[PDB]
Design a binder for this molecule. Sequence first.
Ligand SMILES: OC[C@H]1O[C@H](O[C@H]2[C@H](O)[C@@H](O)[C@@H](O)O[C@@H]2CO)[C@H](O)[C@@H](O)[C@@H]1O
Ligand SMILES: OC[C@H]1OC[C@H](O)[C@@H](O)[C@@H]1O
Ligand SMILES: OC[C@H]1OC[C@H](O)[C@@H](O)[C@@H]1O
Ligand SMILES: OC[C@H]1OC[C@H](O)[C@@H](O)[C@@H]1O
Ligand SMILES: [Mg+2]
Ligand SMILES: [Mg+2]
Ligand SMILES: [Mg+2]
Length: 365
Amino acid sequence: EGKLVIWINGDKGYNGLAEVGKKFEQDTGIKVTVEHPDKLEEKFPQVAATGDGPDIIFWAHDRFGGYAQSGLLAEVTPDKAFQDKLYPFTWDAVRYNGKLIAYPIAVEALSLIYNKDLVPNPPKTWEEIPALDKELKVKGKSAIMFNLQEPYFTWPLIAADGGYAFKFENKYDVKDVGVDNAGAKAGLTFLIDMIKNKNMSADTDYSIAEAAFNKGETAMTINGPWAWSNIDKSKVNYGVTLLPTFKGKPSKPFVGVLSAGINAASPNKELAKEFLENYLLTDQGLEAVNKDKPLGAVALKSFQEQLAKDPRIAATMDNAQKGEIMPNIPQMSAFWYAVRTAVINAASGRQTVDAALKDAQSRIT
Ligand SMILES: OC[C@H]1O[C@H](O[C@H]2[C@H](O)[C@@H](O)[C@@H](O)O[C@@H]2CO)[C@H](O)[C@@H](O)[C@@H]1O
Ligand SMILES: OC[C@H]1OC[C@H](O)[C@@H](O)[C@@H]1O
Ligand SMILES: OC[C@H]1OC[C@H](O)[C@@H](O)[C@@H]1O
Ligand SMILES: OC[C@H]1OC[C@H](O)[C@@H](O)[C@@H]1O
Ligand SMILES: [Mg+2]
Ligand SMILES: [Mg+2]
Ligand SMILES: [Mg+2]
């Protein structure tokens, strides 16, 4: 009691957040400690269920329905004046069983990131990437590398031709799942065909793809706003644009709302509210995080007005509008674990595309 412990993922601007924490302490005398444990989103329910854990947890909103269902989050209590400072759809992302159970911070979607000096006119279709790769391979380069280990990054292609997670009835139907329909299989088959053709490698992960793109070894990558800061520091002149289409249809990234939840076991709920409402969710607080690692579009209208001019943010929102907001229901983690296994198994040859996605469908439903 008398201090704040915050958990945030290691790809986010945790040093910038710590600067907001230092300002909070200067003003209040209350110490703010920012940590970025690994697997924090799996650890939180295990420690919060014993009355331990951080005061504030940051993640995309998809995890938070499961937390709320288990009673691990405090209902947040912003007055109507504060609610009107943030975009309504961001509050919708953090509403569960009619209650607000987090503060929305930022809106994330994946984009195509391209080296302007290797591909001045980036490909508009996935289908043209193999021919581009062939020309780059004679120069000792590759067309594209992105994280193939996490389903977040492959989902936009799987969804393009008709894949979906849970069907929404204007409630989600947790038994109407679109992981093994024909559209999902078509997109995952194309990924596997690129791997078979040696346009990509099944073992590429986040670090490998980031290093290759930021050293000028691959012409394109797929990543979110948090990655831009490291590219700024690199030698690469990059642009951010629409994901390629597949079978003429847009890639459909899942849209995540970075959210801050208050632990139901926290003895510091009033302090957490003060920190989040009056320090973090200000133009200056978000600026401090954003200059560390970019947040994307932000939930705070006044600061989003200042970011909306950036072509990178425009591209982020263009991809977001072609995609879908993630569900926040508890079943979302089952979806992600099952799809992760399916993609890895298909890409490594441990299962056919059809067998992998059928097994995932069975697991989720
Ligand atoms: O891959 C499954 C994973 O997807 C999402 O995680 C994203 C996250 O939203 C981004 O902010 C960034 O950290 O990349 C992650 C993928 O590595 C879901 O939010 C998450 O629950 C899910 O595990
Ligand atoms: O178990 C698969 C994945 O699920 C949760 C962890 O965040 C990631 O470290 C783990 O790989
Ligand atoms: O369950 C262990 C999992 O956790 C972290 C890794 O990202 C994943 O490769 C591994 O399979
Ligand atoms: O891809 C596996 C990942 O999918 C979603 C989960 O939130 C995270 O724990 C899980 O790691
Ligand atoms: Mg983690
Ligand atoms: Mg609650
Ligand atoms: Mg792996």
